[PDB]
Design a protein around this ligand. Structure first.
Ligand code: SF4
Ligand code: SF4
Ligand code: FES
Lengths: 52, 230
């Protein structure tokens, strides 16, 4: 349209990096339930005080 | 004269010939953990928490009930003593329920000021936790006999200073209990003064029961006047 290219003659032409993320391709939600790994020598039979 | 220099962590001190390892190590400004012991009581040893690795010996002894021979090296912090003070205070922290939101000695129990400093980090038990029942004795001693880590400290007090022969030990092995077999009440002079001696919050005060936690008070010393001895 004719109001479009006047934005494209002024200050270059971007058309994609809008100042809103309000449109699509903003991350909406995330589904899965989380579970945390328990790693750093939390286990037994060697993990043992007076060493740490 | 009448002394032995014992190198407590390689440092000389002269005790009487016939004192204890506990009083020797407490003389030089140290604390070994104390469960089955009291100065104002007799001496037993059935908690087995004080365990020091004595030098020139493969074994470990307990500092409650043994004399001190010619001058040893009482190696307090070792790489084996901490394999013992971790060791004993992992068992007795298992067969015990999850109280202290509601345990009325919740700011001063000796499973709570030993368990940060000494001992382990997590648990591996992982199910069990026997649960005995309680009773009532008098209208002064709020009574949860579940917790009751059987340190035999209230028990000897019946044979000690308060001469009322009332309590005993009922049971064998894992299942023993502390309370009176029959439902005889226990009340005389000094009868409310057991709830200081019980080192965990298994015994507590009946009127005080659910009021406030002990980190909010302001301790100010004074004297009571209801008798002539002060
Ligand atoms: S009242 Fe509890 S802590 Fe005190 S001596 Fe008896 S069993 Fe041990
Ligand atoms: S008496 Fe000791 S073990 Fe019992 S709830 Fe209080 S701190 Fe925990
Ligand atoms: S502290 Fe009483 S026996 Fe070790």
């Amino acid at each position: 349209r004719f109001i479009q290219w006047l934005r494209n003659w002024a200050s270059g032409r971007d058309l994609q990096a809008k100042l809103q993320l309000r449109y699509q391709e903003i991350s909406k939600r995330t589904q899965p339930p989380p579970k945390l790994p328990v790693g750093p020598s939390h286990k037994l039979s060697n993990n043992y005080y007076c060493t740490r | 004269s009448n002394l032995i220099e014992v190198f407590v962590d390689g440092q000389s001190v002269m005790v009487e010939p016939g004192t204890t390892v506990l009083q020797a190590c407490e003389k030089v400004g140290m604390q070994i953990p104390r469960f089955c012991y009291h100065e104002r009581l007799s001496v037993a040893g059935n908690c087995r928490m004080c365990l020091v690795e004595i030098e020139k010996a493969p074994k470990v002894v307990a500092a409650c009930a043994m004399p001190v021979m010619k001058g040893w090296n009482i190696l307090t912090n070792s790489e084996k003593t901490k394999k013992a003070r971790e060791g004993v205070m992992e068992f007795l922290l298992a067969n015990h329920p999850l109280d202290c939101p509601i345990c009325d000695q919740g700011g001063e129990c000796d499973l709570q000021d030993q368990s940060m400093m000494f001992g382990s980090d997590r648990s591996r038990f992982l199910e069990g936790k026997r649960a005995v029942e309680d009773k009532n004795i008098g209208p002064l001693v709020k009574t949860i006999m579940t917790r009751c880590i059987q340190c035999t400290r209230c028990i000897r007090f019946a044979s000690e200073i308060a001469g009322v022969d009332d309590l005993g030990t009922t049971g064998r092995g894992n299942d023993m209990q502390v309370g009176t077999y029959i439902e005889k009440m226990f009340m005389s002079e000094l009868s409310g003064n057991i709830i200081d001696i019980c080192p965990v919050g298994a015994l507590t005060s009946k009127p005080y029961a659910f009021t406030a936690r002990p980190w909010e008070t302001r301790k100010t010393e004074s004297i009571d006047v209801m008798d002539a001895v002060g």
